[PDB]
């Protein structure tokens, strides 16, 4: 809906609406992926990224819980 607003008036046909709706759905997917990655950047908001945090800590532990993994990471440091 953003592009069709930016798009000229004479291009208000159904094909343009469908194409830009698909592109907007792709935009939503991309932005939610970006938000998920930004959450993964932080330890508290990361879910599957804790594996590399443990690898940096050089301790290998079986996956039990995300909160448990974060607690173990906090305990390992200092």
């Amino acid at each position: 809906m953003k592009l069709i607003d930016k798009l000229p008036s004479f291009d208000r046909n159904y094909i343009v609406e469908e194409i830009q709706g698909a592109y907007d759905t792709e935009l939503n997917i991309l932005k939610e992926d970006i938000d998920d990655t930004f959450n993964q950047l932080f330890v508290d908001t990361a879910t599957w990224g804790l594996d590399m945090w443990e690898d940096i800590l050089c301790i290998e532990k079986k996956e039990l819980d995300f909160d448990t993994r974060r607690s173990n990471i906090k305990a390992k440091m200092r």
Partner: protein
């Protein structure tokens, strides 16, 4: 010494200018060749101004819609609109020159005759 290379035929989608909606031939947009693409380009350029939409390039667009709404008298805005059309249409490399004949005053509707010179 080498001669100028001819501009290749401009191909793109086609539709009825009165319909203002794209047309599909058995699923394929109608092919435009020779004197078919330039009419579409001129229609697109004149129909919408660039300054309204941020996406278009600054060189694109026309300021004829400023005269829409009766912001000035017709006597000088006739030549002003002729100049505006000349500025808006000669930007295309395909088009050579644009000529405006005159304007017809009747009620609130203004009718003018404008000419297009092409290469093919």
């Amino acid at each position: 010494l080498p001669k100028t290379e001819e501009l290749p035929i401009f191909r793109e989608v086609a539709w009825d200018f009165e319909k203002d909606e794209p047309i599909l031939e058995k699923g394929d947009f109608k092919i435009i060749e020779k004197k078919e693409a330039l009419k579409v380009w001129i229609y697109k350029c004149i129909k919408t101004n660039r300054y309204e939409h941020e996406i278009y390039s600054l060189e694109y667009g026309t300021e004829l819609s400023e005269l829409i709404g009766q912001k000035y008298t017709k006597g000088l805005t006739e030549s002003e609109a002729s100049r505006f059309i000349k500025e808006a249409l000669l930007i295309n490399p395909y088009i050579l020159e644009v000529n405006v004949k005159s304007a017809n005053f009747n009620r609130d509707i203004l009718s003018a005759n404008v000419k297009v010179s092409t290469i093919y």
